[PDB]
From a paper:
Islet amyloid polypeptide (IAPP, or amylin) is a 37-residue peptide hormone that is cosecreted with insulin and one of the most amyloid-prone sequences known. Overproduction and aggregation of IAPP leads to amyloid deposition in the islets of Langerhans, a pathological hallmark of type-2 diabetes. Although the precise link between IAPP aggregation and disease remains uncertain, IAPP aggregates have been shown to be toxic in cell-based assays, and genetic and animal studies implicate islet amyloid in the progressive loss of pancreatic β-cell function. Over 40 different proteins, with diverse native structures or in many cases intrinsic disorder, form amyloid associated with human disease, yet all amyloid fibrils share a common cross-β architecture consisting of a continuous intermolecular β-sheet supported by networks of zipper and ladder-like interactions. Amyloid fibrils have a similar cross-β architecture, but fibrils formed by a single protein sequence can have diverse structures, varying with time, self-assembly conditions, and sequence modifications.
Cryo-EM was performed on fibrils assembled from 30 μM IAPP in the same buffer used for kinetic assays (160 mM ammonium acetate, pH 7.4, 1% v/v DMSO), in the absence (4 replicates) or presence (2 replicates each) of 50 μM YX-I-1, canagliflozin, or doxazosin. Fibrils were imaged after 2 weeks, at which point fibril formation was at a steady state, as judged by analyzing aliquots with ThT. Fibrils with a similar morphology were observed for the control (no small molecule) and doxazosin-containing samples, with the majority having a twisted ribbon morphology and crossover distances of 60–100 nm. Following helical reconstruction, multiple distinct IAPP fibril polymorphs were resolved, revealing further detail on the apparent morphological differences between the samples. The majority of fibrils formed in the control (69%) and doxazosin-treated (72%) samples were classified into three related fibril structures (named LL, LLU, and LLUU, respectively), which have a shared structural core consisting of a pair of protofilaments related by a 21-screw symmetry. Each protofilament is formed from a single stack of L-shaped IAPP subunits, with straight β-strand segments encompassing 13ANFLVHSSNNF23 and 25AILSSTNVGSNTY37-NH2, hinging on a turn at Gly24. In addition, further flanking subunits presenting U-shaped IAPP subunit conformations and ambiguous β-strands were observed adhering to these two β-sheets, with the combinations of these flanking subunits differing to generate the three individual polymorphs LL, LLU, and LLUU. Thus, out of the fibril structures that were identified in each data set, YX-I-1 fibrils consisted of 89% C-fold subunits, whereas this subunit fold was absent from fibrils grown in the control or with doxazosin. By contrast, the control and doxazosin-treated samples consisted of L-fold (62% or 72%, respectively), U-fold (34% or 28%), and S-fold (4% or 0%) subunits.
Numbering used by the authors:
A (entry chain K), B (entry chain N), C (entry chain Q), D (entry chain H), E (entry chain E), F (entry chain B): 14 to 37
G (entry chain P), H (entry chain M), I (entry chain J), J (entry chain G), K (entry chain D), L (entry chain A): 13 to 37
M (entry chain R), N (entry chain O), O (entry chain L), P (entry chain I), Q (entry chain F), R (entry chain C): 14 to 31
Write the structure that this text describes.
Amino acid sequence: NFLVHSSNNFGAILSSTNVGSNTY
Amino acid sequence: NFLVHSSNNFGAILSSTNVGSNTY
Amino acid sequence: NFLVHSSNNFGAILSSTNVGSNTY
Amino acid sequence: NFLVHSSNNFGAILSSTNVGSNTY
Amino acid sequence: NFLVHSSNNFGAILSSTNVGSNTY
Amino acid sequence: NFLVHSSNNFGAILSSTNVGSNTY
Amino acid sequence: ANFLVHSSNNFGAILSSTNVGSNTY
Amino acid sequence: ANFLVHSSNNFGAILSSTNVGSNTY
Amino acid sequence: ANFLVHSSNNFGAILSSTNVGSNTY
Amino acid sequence: ANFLVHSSNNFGAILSSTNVGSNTY
Amino acid sequence: ANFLVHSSNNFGAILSSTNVGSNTY
Amino acid sequence: ANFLVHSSNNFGAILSSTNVGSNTY
Amino acid sequence: NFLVHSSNNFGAILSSTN
Amino acid sequence: NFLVHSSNNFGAILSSTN
Amino acid sequence: NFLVHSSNNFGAILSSTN
Amino acid sequence: NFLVHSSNNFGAILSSTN
Amino acid sequence: NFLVHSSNNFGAILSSTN
Amino acid sequence: NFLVHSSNNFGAILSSTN
C-alpha cells in the first residue's frame, strides 16, 4: 500500500467566515 | 494498491461565507 | 489497483455563500 | 505501508473568522 | 510502516479570530 | 515503524485572537 | 395609536445542519 | 401612542451544527 | 408615549456546534 | 414618556462548542 | 421621562467550550 | 427624569473552557 | 370562574388550569 | 376565581394553576 | 382569588400557583 | 388572595406560590 | 394576602411564598 | 399581609416568605 498526497498552492487566498447573529 | 493525489493551485481565490441571521 | 487523481487550477475563483435569514 | 503527505504553500493567505453576536 | 509528513510554508499569513459578543 | 514529521516556516505570521465580550 | 410591529413566536423544535466546503483546487 | 416594536419569543428546543472548511489547495 | 423597543425572550434549550478550519494549503 | 429600550431575557439552558484551526500550510 | 435602557437578565445554565489553534506551518 | 442605564443580572451557573495555542512552526 | 381578557396582544399569553 | 387581564402584551405571560 | 393585571408588558411575567 | 399588578415591564417578573 | 405592585420594572423581581 | 411596591427597579429584588 503506497499512498501519496501532494498539495501545492501558489495563489493568494482570502477567506471570510461569519457565523451567528441569531436572535432567540 | 498505489494511490496518488495531486492538487496544484495557481489562481487567486476569494471566498465569503455567512451563516445565521435567523430570528426565533 | 493504480489510481491517480489530478486537479490543476489556473483561474481566479470567487465564491459567495449565504445561509440563513429565516424567521420562525 | 508507505504513506507520504506533502503540503507546500507559496501564497499569501488572509483569513478572518467571526463567531457570535447572538442575542438570547 | 513508513510514514512521512512534510509542511513547508513560504507565504505571509495573517489570521484574525473573534469569538463572543453574545448577550444573554 | 518509522515516522518522520517536518515543519519548515519561512513566512511572516501575524495572528490575533479575541475571546469574550459576553454579557450575562 | 400608530403601531409598527414585527413579531415572531416559535413553539416548535428546530434542527439545522449546514456543511460548506470540501472543494479541491 | 406611537409604538415601534421588534419582539421575538422562543419556546422550542433548537439544535444547530455548522461545518466550514476541509478545502485542499 | 413613544416606545422604541427591541425585546427577546427565550425559554428553550439551545445547542450549537461550530467547526471552522481543516484546510490544507 | 419616551422609551428607547433593548431587553433580553433568557430562561433556557445553552450549550456551545467552537473549534477553529487545524490548518496545515 | 426619557429612558435609554439596555438590560439583560439570565436565569439559565450556560456551558461554553472554545478551541483555537492546532495549525502546522 | 433622564435615565441612561446599562444593567445586567445573572442567576445561572456558567462554565467556560478556553484553549489557545498548540501551533507548530 | 376562568376568564382571560386580552387587548393588542403581540406576544404569547399562556394560561393553564389543572 | 381565576382572572387574567392583559393590555398591549408584547412579551410572554405564563399563568399556571394546579 | 387569583388576579393578574398587566399593562405595556414587553418582558416575561410568570405566575405559578400550586 | 394572590394578585400581580405590572406596568411597563421590560424585565422578568417571577411569582411562585406553593 | 399577597400583593405585588411594580412600576417601570427593568430588572428582575422575584417573590416566592411557601 | 405581604406587599411589595417597586418603582424604577433596575437591580434585583428578592423576597422570600416561609
